[PDB]
């Protein structure tokens, strides 16, 4: 049994309610995600006050009692906080499922003498024997 462990066995400390334990809402990598498209309308709309991903108390009971909607389509699931450090992107069941995160790069800091950047690297009919591209799957 290669690489087997449960990170949710004992991580940190705190006081939680034994009764306040949901069994749904885990928006992990369990769906055929796509980019999509940006659709705007004739009405601006506020779009709701945008917040941050560093949400402290991230709960989700979901009142699955007074009605509901069953969907067979892909829209039956919607992952959230997977474009950065999300507290829900570590609720993974199996130890192997690092498909919940995004790693970007870092820009130099202001207050430096000499404008030293990165080479623009302009290939001009060289054709390297190294094609393709790769993403970066980081922890949470």
């Amino acid at each position: 049994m290669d690489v087997f462990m449960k990170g949710l066995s004992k991580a940190k400390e705190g006081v939680v309610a034994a009764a306040e334990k949901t069994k749904q809402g885990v928006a992990e990598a369990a769906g055929k995600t796509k980019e999509g498209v940006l659709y705007v309308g004739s009405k601006t709309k506020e779009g709701v006050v945008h917040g941050v991903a560093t949400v402290a108390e991230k709960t989700k009971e979901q009142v699955t009692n007074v009605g509901g909607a069953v969907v067979t389509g892909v829209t039956a699931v919607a992952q959230k906080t997977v474009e950065g450090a999300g507290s829900i992107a570590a609720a993974t069941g199996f130890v192997k499922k690092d498909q919940l995160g995004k790693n970007e790069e870092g820009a130099p800091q202001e207050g430096i003498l000499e404008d030293m950047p990165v080479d623009p690297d302009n290939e001009a009919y060289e054709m390297p024997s190294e094609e393709g591209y790769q993403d970066y799957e980081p922890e949470a």
Partner: protein, 41 residues
């Protein structure tokens, strides 16, 4: 460690009424359904 891999409770979750509900869209990770507990409406 995943205790359900060393113990295997083999708990099956079957409601008396299946209407408005969902499921894990991953056969590989479908074991998480038998790695946790269910809810009663």
């Amino acid at each position: 460690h995943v205790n359900e891999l060393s113990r295997i409770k083999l708990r099956v979750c079957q409601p008396s009424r299946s209407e408005i509900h969902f499921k894990v869209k991953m056969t590989t990770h479908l074991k998480k359904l038998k790695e946790s507990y269910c809810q009663r409406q």
